[PDB]
Symmetry: C2
């Protein structure tokens, strides 16, 4: 293991949370959208979900984790607008 997942919600307001290890990509995505629904009503295009997989190695394992998170968030309406694999981590950006 030794691979952390970090999610930051931006809507100017920014909320970053370290994901506890053990959950699945669907459980992580469901928990994040529930936190975003705490600031409900107004908040869709302005909402930016950024996920970070630390560290970025092994690249094959970290890319699979990023792909699974991409599957969960895009099945929930969000769209992957950015992906960067530099800086000892993989950084994803989702928007509604």
């Amino acid at each position: 293991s030794h691979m952390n997942i970090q999610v930051s919600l931006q809507w100017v307001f920014s909320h970053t949370v370290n994901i506890p290890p053990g959950g699945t990509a669907e459980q992580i995505a469901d928990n994040i959208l529930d936190m975003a629904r705490s600031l409900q009503d107004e908040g869709w295009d302005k909402l930016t979900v950024q996920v970070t997989v630390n560290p970025g190695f092994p690249k094959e394992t970290a890319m699979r984790v990023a792909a699974a998170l991409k599957e969960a968030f895009e099945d929930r309406g969000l769209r992957l607008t950015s992906i960067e694999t530099s800086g000892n981590s993989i950084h994803l950006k989702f928007r509604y």
Copy 2:
């Protein structure tokens, strides 16, 4: 279709953005950035990054094909894609020299 290519070198941090004329192949674009990066490699510059930007992203069929053409042109010359971003009606690609 507007294309911008940026070249960034670090030691502290420098960058230079140029605009590509409409009548240019993806080969001449990549060969031109290689020549600008080879001179910086001869000098004392470490991390070399290349960013490509396709400003009109209205037709994703030709915007991605322009991006996919430039991607293969830089990868066939030793550059590694490290970032893809589609925001602000533009498509940004960042490479590592």
